[PDB]
Amino acid sequence: TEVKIGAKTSVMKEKDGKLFTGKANKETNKVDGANATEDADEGKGLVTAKDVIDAVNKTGWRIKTTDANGQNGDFATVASGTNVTFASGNGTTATVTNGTDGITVKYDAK
Amino acid sequence: TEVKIGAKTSVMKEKDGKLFTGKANKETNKVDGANATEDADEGKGLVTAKDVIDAVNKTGWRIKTTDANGQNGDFATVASGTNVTFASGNGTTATVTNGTDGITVKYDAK
Amino acid sequence: TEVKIGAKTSVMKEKDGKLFTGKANKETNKVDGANATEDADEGKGLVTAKDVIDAVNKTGWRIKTTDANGQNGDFATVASGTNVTFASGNGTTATVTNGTDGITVKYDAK
């Protein structure tokens, strides 16, 4: 019955919490796409709900982690839905509260 | 004059700062959609600007809050645009600076 | 050969880490769009991959910064991909670890 009309989609790439076109990911970030089409993809195409859901879930800020010896390690992406806890420490007390001015994190010294 | 050609859209669900298809939200997260269509929605459909704006604004990381007694409480979503303050505390001083390496939060002991 | 069928797109605006329709940005945020079309744009239109990539990259949470004298300054947007470091300070030690419960930031007093 119907006439099917194809609308080309574009891919959305992610690296380190940030989104990129297929072309930018290949050319700026030096990450190989799945094929020559992705590598040339300037993002002019449409996207699906699932595409957006998946891409957005990958994004986030980058937090510097520390290693087993407490020294600086790699960044980690604090992606959508990622839990973050500000823990009390030796001789300190952490509180995290929510109000009209947003979130307030605080450390007190014991 | 024109011939109207309908393109089916898909919904984007959110839970705790993360996005989900209608089907995933129902089946993995056990949250009822508005109807059977949403509950079966695998995200193959298109989305509007407003859809994306609204969905993206809901996303964010999750921060552990503390209650009126300073004990661990629920997480809260630090959504797009949410203000976060790192406050100085009893015998501590907070500074938050911005540079080429991004943001640096620091607590000094007085 | 082909018949070209135009699908109207909608713009996605950003302010302070949050997304808005063209109409909302103009009317609620009081920011001029590029033209009368943007200013009336309710987001019913489609978007491209690049549109979503660019808009999503602008979003993030807002962190209160402190100025050259350590006093409260402006907020800054911690956008997708933005690096955040929790630095050890005078008489304190910062650790940031990653586990099954997500990220845990901690300050110990020396």
Numbering used by the authors:
A (entry chain A), B (entry chain A), C (entry chain A): 313 to 422
Quote the original article.
In a subset of nontypeable strains, the major nonpilus adhesin is a protein called Hia. Hia contains two homologous binding domains, called HiaBD1 and HiaBD2, that interact with the same host cell receptor.
The crystal structure of Hia307–422 was determined to a resolution of 1.8 Å. The nonadhesive Hia307–422 fragment contains three distinct domains, including the last strand of the preceding W2 domain (βW25), a novel “KG1” domain, and the W3 domain. Although the conformation of βW25 observed in Hia307–422 might not accurately reflect the conformation it adopts in the W2 domain, it may be used to envisage the structural transition between Trp-ring domains via a KG connector domain. The structure of the KG1 domain appears to be related to the structure of the IsNeck domain, with the secondary structures positioned similarly relative to each other. However, it must be noted that the topologies of the IN and KG domains(i.e., the way the secondary structures are connected) are very different. The W3 domain in Hia307–422 is similar to the W1 domain in HiaBD2 and to the W5 domains in HiaBD1, with the same number of strands and the same angle of the strands relative to the axis of the trimer. While HiaBD1 has structural similarities with Hia307–422, αIN3 in HiaBD1 does not have a corresponding region in KG1 in Hia307–422, and αIN2 in HiaBD1 is oriented differently from αKG1 in Hia307–422. Thus, two important structural determinants of binding in the IN domain are either absent or misoriented in the KG domain, explaining why Hia307–422 is nonadhesive.
